[model samples]
Target: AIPMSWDSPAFSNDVIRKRHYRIGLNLFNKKPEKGVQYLIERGFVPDTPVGVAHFLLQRKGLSRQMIGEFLGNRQKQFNRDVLDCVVDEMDFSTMELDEALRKFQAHIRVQGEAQKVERLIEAFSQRYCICNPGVVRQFRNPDTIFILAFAIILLNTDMYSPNVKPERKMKLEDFIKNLRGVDDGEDIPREMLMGIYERIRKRELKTNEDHVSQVQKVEKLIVGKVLSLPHRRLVCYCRLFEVPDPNKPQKLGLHQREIFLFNDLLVVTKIFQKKKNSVTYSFRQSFSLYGMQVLLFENQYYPNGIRLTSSVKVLINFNAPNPQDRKKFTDDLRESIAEVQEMEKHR
Candidate 1:
């Protein structure tokens, strides 16, 4: 029998790698010191392979074949064992659940108004009901109920919170004026600005409102209808690249660490640093889900990459850290697109 130790080059073989990862996962669950040490010895970093695999496997719509393709598998038995361990390990104990709920509730109360907490609780209960249908008391333990509720609250921080009014409203004239703040005003697209200005002018004005009021009214309509929408809830983060030239598609532009969110539309944002402790936002963009095309694992340059074409003909590329995440993101994007299209059809 071969002695199991982190000292071997087990990662070289597919079956061996799977077996080693399995042992490491179990060991981490049982005795983390040995498990973590074993994994690190085999070149796994931060001693959390088990946790990563567990998180990915727990997500919906992940097929066994998919997992096998990404990470190797020798037999079904091994996969089943790994999944069982993941399931057991992920469940919180009674005390742990109580502590988690208390901490989460306190955090929400401090950050948001009292009403938001109730909204969070209601959302949590509804989600739990969907997961555990037709049960009067879905969860066996009250602690479990609270634990799951807190989990929902933490995951959906963008939602279930009171909306903060903007410190200053964004006006069209001001936007056009400051649009070229980062560069020479010569590069500012006057033609584009004038076109928008003309569109606003063309709109039929209501009687009794003065010129200034009508302009403000157009501003309000534009701002409220277009700009005032809240930022999307973050789905996840991944690396993105832009094609500088469509003809020379291989010549990629700057790489961006992009944030993904679904806010009735697909919104992408680029973050910038302003100071040591402060940050700023730039390159904010949105794309309609209708007529959107999503291409998965398309880039030869990046593993598990995705390409998205918006209805407006903007092309964006992204690469997830692993195949599992790539699959999850792809599934989510497709589902969201389908949903939006269906809604639009009905309307």
Candidate 2:
């Protein structure tokens, strides 16, 4: 992150912007141990942090003037030195690999359990009438099901006991983790954890005023209307329009891509598990205004890799103006949905 200077307005002008970078080609190579080696080759001074700006600016063609201006503006909102220290730390050469691996393993365990947590959310969905419709129809819909699961997870995580011992850790794990004193090892059903999280959260939770505005940002991204329910409260309503007429001139094909994508992601998760004992791929992609950015698997690590990685995309028309395109997109979407619905009916 660059600081904004008072001269930012003048420097931001395209004609005056810097046009070159002096990057080392060796920096791009995939060597896990070269981080300090590259830094040493560049020559270090006690206060030589300015070299980072110089190299990236000259070699990568990034604007230092804009960066300075950004920093200048940020200084007003944050402790400038704190931000600097947080951003400029590159001294990981002497770091212990075992410590990093411990964190990675913990992350994998939490993610692995989140699967069972979602299943528990489903069981609760059937009990609480939170689902949109009868039987398992709404439970099977990916958006509805996952959001419900996410909501439950969020509730359970955020709302914790003030009375419990400070070191007792989170209580939601009692339901989520596969253990406890029960015959057949049958405890809470796999589908009730989220609802339990939600229920426990509601006891002492208070709603914030600015929450709607924050949710609106997500609403804008996926093109959904925001809805309010009593328990879950905030929901994104994906408006499903007409389906393809089965007897029409063309038999619309099912858009099985969503299923395929979900399956592919599950496979990736399994691969990560198999490698977790020896390798680290715990990173996750960053979410963006456009959507989520993909992570580099080699450099991959995510705080919420398991939950976030399940997100997949499918083609859909969001309030399209043209009639022909809207008709075509909606027809395919309907067929895709109905295919799943038909399978559910048989089940």
Candidate 3:
């Protein structure tokens, strides 16, 4: 029963963009077709190849604005020959197209374009392969960790990053450019995109070329971002079990914990979220390993035990699952420690 309200403040570009973000980030369902329908029915985004090409390409960072000249607060069905033809052939079409598309509807009309504009969009997507058939299909997927990690860096740049100049911060108009077809072009916070990208590049510079260790790399991105420490990366993440009360080890036995060890820090997180492959977690506590100790000992209820002692002491016991997995984590912590020990040698 809700009609599209282009003129209402509630349906303004700002609100539209917010809804689009929700769909893209999958606060809704994680189905590609389902997401597109929601965006379409809400008038937040277009469903056709041409309009969707613009919306998705904007996020994929490949906006070319193929419809810019044809749509600008205007109204008309453009001739098929008009696309490849000269601009002044009709003489009046330039301004006619300017008052074009009821502002931008012509682009999203699906069958109204005579298949020409859509064909170009298809070609453009094919060239980049970023917006091609299935890549766009993943619009609903939370995706693998590196991609998700990479996305967070971009999100923070615009939404939460600091800026020295208030006047230069991202305006709502500019943010709209990322989701809309007209009004403005690309002026996204790319320098920030590149900066975090560079950090990621340096983090994975050596390992980026290696495929054997891809699984652990995502948790690295997650732990650092959640901890607000972009400089470090996740080394390994382990799921461990622990008792609720330190004094009594028999009640709930052990709930789950996230032992996230990074290159420079060990962060404990609470496991959390939805979507089959997507993982969620929250901050539990973090140890910098700067002034920390990893002590392993024997216990009856727990077969494999390691106690992390510091200003905040945590006693976590594990079935250890596989012998090597437990050994792998303990040695990793010890190894992470010795690097600091070597630095202390000079101090």
TM-scores of all predicted structures: 0.31, 0.15, 0.35
RMSD, every candidate, angstroms: 24.2, 25.2, 23.4
The residue-level lDDT of candidate 3 at 347 comes to 19
Worst 10 residues of 3 by lDDT: 204-213
Which lDDT value does model 1 have at 90? 36
Q: Number of the top candidate by TM-score?
A: 3
lDDT of 1 by residue, 264-343 (tens): 35655555655676343454566777789798755455666677876546467676566877787776777666545543
lDDT of each: 0.43, 0.29, 0.43
Q: What is the lDDT of residue 77 in candidate 2?
A: 30
Q: Over the stretch 1-347, how does candidate 2's per-residue lDDT look in tens digits?
A: 66788657666444222110011212221221232234446442122334433332233212222222222223233323322432333222222222221222221111224434343233333333322344223233433433433543454344564655645645667446633322233333444554455455555332222323333343243321122111111211122121122123222222111111110111011112234334222222212112222221111211111111114342221222234533443333333332223222231
Candidate 1 to truth, TM: 0.31
Among residues 3 or more apart in sequence or in different chains, the pairs in candidate 1 whose N, CA or C atoms overlap within 3 Å are none
Which stretches of model 3 miss by more than 4 angstroms? 1-231, 244-248, 251-253, 311-319, 344-347
Per-residue accuracy of model 3 over 1-347 as CA lDDT, tens digit each: 66767666675666446534443423112333344455678675654545544453234211112232232112333321222222211122222111221122222221234344344333222222321334324334312222323233343354443553556655544443443321133222444334533443343211011111342355443433343222233457786665443334553325667777765677776666646877667666676777677777545555566677665365443445455777999877776665444333231
